[PDB]
Ligand binder design. Sequence first.
Ligand SMILES: [Pt+4]
Ligand SMILES: [Pt+4]
Length: 129
Amino acid sequence: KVFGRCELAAAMKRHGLDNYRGYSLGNWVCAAKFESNFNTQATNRNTDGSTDYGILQINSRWWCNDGRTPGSRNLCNIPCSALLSSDITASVNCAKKIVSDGNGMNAWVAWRNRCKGTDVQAWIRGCRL
Ligand SMILES: [Pt+4]
Ligand SMILES: [Pt+4]
């Protein structure tokens, strides 16, 4: 499913991401925009053989099992395919574990490069939240 910007802001807010570990909603919407262009079905292969999955491009080296990343850790305890669902619950629950890991939202390279230190409130502007 391809989310609309305000639709995704509302689903993220409902799932408890607004201000989770200090990151306002706009940060999460911005990361999703640049990680996956709001498409829950986005996949991208990394040079190391791992793959990134879903709206927040969560990586199979650490976070999920895809059966093809030798020595992967599966920290979210989830098949990576679960991250591609139109229901963002699994992605959100896994993201919460990731952002708690010590490096906050810097774990998402597009957030670091394209969202960090920008006016992220613009991403929720005009939305009925
Ligand atoms: Pt569809
Ligand atoms: Pt909803």
